[PDB]
Amino acid sequence: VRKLEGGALVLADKGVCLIDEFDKMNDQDRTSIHEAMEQQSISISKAGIVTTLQARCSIIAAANPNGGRYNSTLPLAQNVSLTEPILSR
């Protein structure tokens, strides 16, 4: 709520949310995407306004492997920076 507005998620509900370069995302956003995937709703507690908006969006993502084209024989989760639990979603 800025001097109310949804992120891409709320805005795109029922539609398709399109994100790229996860790796460059500040954690502050990362938690938001995680929550959205998890419960299919974004909750906002600030300032006085208190709700749960509903983003049902399909997330399509573009991610960039750590360093080179194929970083290692090592598994995908090892290949890229994004943690395994967010990836499991």
Partner 1 sequence: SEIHVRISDFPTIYSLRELRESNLSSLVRVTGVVTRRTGVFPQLKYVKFNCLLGPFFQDSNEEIRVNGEKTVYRNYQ
Residue 77 binding partner 1, by CB under 8 A: no
CB of 7 to partner 1, least distance (A): 17
CB 84 within 8 A of CB 77: yes
Supply 80's token pair. Answer: 């890229």
Answer yes or no whether residue 16 interacts with partner 1 by CB under 8 A: no
Closest CA relative to residue 60, chosen from 81, 41, 37:
37
Contact pick of 50, 62, 75, 88 for partner 1 (by CB under 8 A): 50
Residues that bind partner 1 (CB under 8 A): 4, 48-51
